[PDB]
Amino acid sequence: LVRKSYQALALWKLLCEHQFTIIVAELQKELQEQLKITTFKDLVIRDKELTGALIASLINCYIRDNAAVDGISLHLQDIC
Amino acid sequence: VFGNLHQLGGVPGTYQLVRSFLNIKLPAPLPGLQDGEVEGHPVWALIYYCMRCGDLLAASQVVNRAQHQLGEFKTWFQEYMNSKDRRLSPATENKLRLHYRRALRNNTDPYKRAVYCIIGRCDVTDNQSEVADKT
Numbered sequence: 001l002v003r004k005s006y007q008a009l010a011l012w013k014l015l016c017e018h019q020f021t022i023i024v025a026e027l028q029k030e031l032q033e034q035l036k037i038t039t040f041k042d043l044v045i046r047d048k049e050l051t052g053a054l055i056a057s058l059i060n061c062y063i064r065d066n067a068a069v070d071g072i073s074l075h076l077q078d079i080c
Numbered sequence: 081v082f083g084n085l086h087q088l089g090g091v092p093g094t095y096q097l098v099r100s101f102l103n104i105k106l107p108a109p110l111p112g113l114q115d116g117e118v119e120g121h122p123v124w125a126l127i128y129y130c131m132r133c134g135d136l137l138a139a140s141q142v143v144n145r146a147q148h149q150l151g152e153f154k155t156w157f158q159e160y161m162n163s164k165d166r167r168l169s170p171a172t173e174n175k176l177r178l179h180y181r182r183a184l185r186n187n188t189d190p191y192k193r194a195v196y197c198i199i200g201r202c203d204v205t206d207n208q209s210e211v212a213d214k215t
Contacts, residue, residue: 014110017111017112018111018120058110059109059110061104062103062104062105062108062111063108063110063111064108064109064110064111064112065107065108065109065110065111065112065113066107066108066109066110066111066112066113066114066115067112067113068108068109068110068111068112069108069109069110069111069112070109070110071110072109072110073109
C-alpha cells in the first residue's frame with residue numbers, strides 16, 4: 001500500500017509540472033462524472049484504466065517534458 | 081503548426097511556430113531535461129532553431145529579451161547579424177573565443193554551446209554533441 005501511494009503521488013508530481021488543466025478539460029467525456037468523484041484513496045487503491053488513458057494522452061501530447069515523459073512510458077510498461 | 085492544436089493559441093508569427101515545434105515536437109515526450117528554461121521555454125533551443133530556420137533576426141531579438149548573463153555574447157550576436165553574417169570585427173572575436181574555451185566549452189546546455197560555436201566559429205574541430213538530430 002505504501003508503495004502504491006508513492007506511485008500515485010509520483011504521477012501527480014509529474015502532472016503538476018505543466019499543461020495538465022487543458023488536457024483535462026478536453027478529454028473528459030461520459031466517464032467524466034466518475035472521474036471527478038475520484039478520491040485520493042481511489043488512486044491509492046487504483047482505478048487503472050482511466051489513468052492509463054490519461055497518461056497516454058499526457059505522453060502523446062506535448063505536455064510531458066523530457067525526463068518526465070520517459071518515466072510515464074516506463075510506468076505504462078511496468079504497471080499498465 | 082499547420083494542423084490542429086492550440087490552431088495554436090497565439091498569432092502565426094514565425095517565433096511562435098518554432099516555439100510550437102520545440103514544445104509540441106519531440107523536445108518533450110512529457111516534458112523535461114537539461115535545458116535552460118524561463119517561463120516554460122527553452123530560450124537557447126529557440127535561438128538555435130530560429131537560426132536553423134534562417135530567421136537570424138528573430139533569434140537575435142529572442143536573445144535581447146532573454147534574461148541571461150553571458151551578455152557579452154549578446155553583443156557578438158548583434159553585428160554578426162548586422163553584417164553579411166560573416167561577422168568579422170577586427171576587434172573582439174578573439175575575446176569571444178577565449179570565453180568559449182574557458183567557460184562554455186567544458187560544461188553547458190547543448191543549445192547554448194551550439195549557438196556559441198556556430199555563430200563564433202569558436203572551435204574548428206567540428207561537431208555538436210547533443211543536438212545534431214538530422215543529416
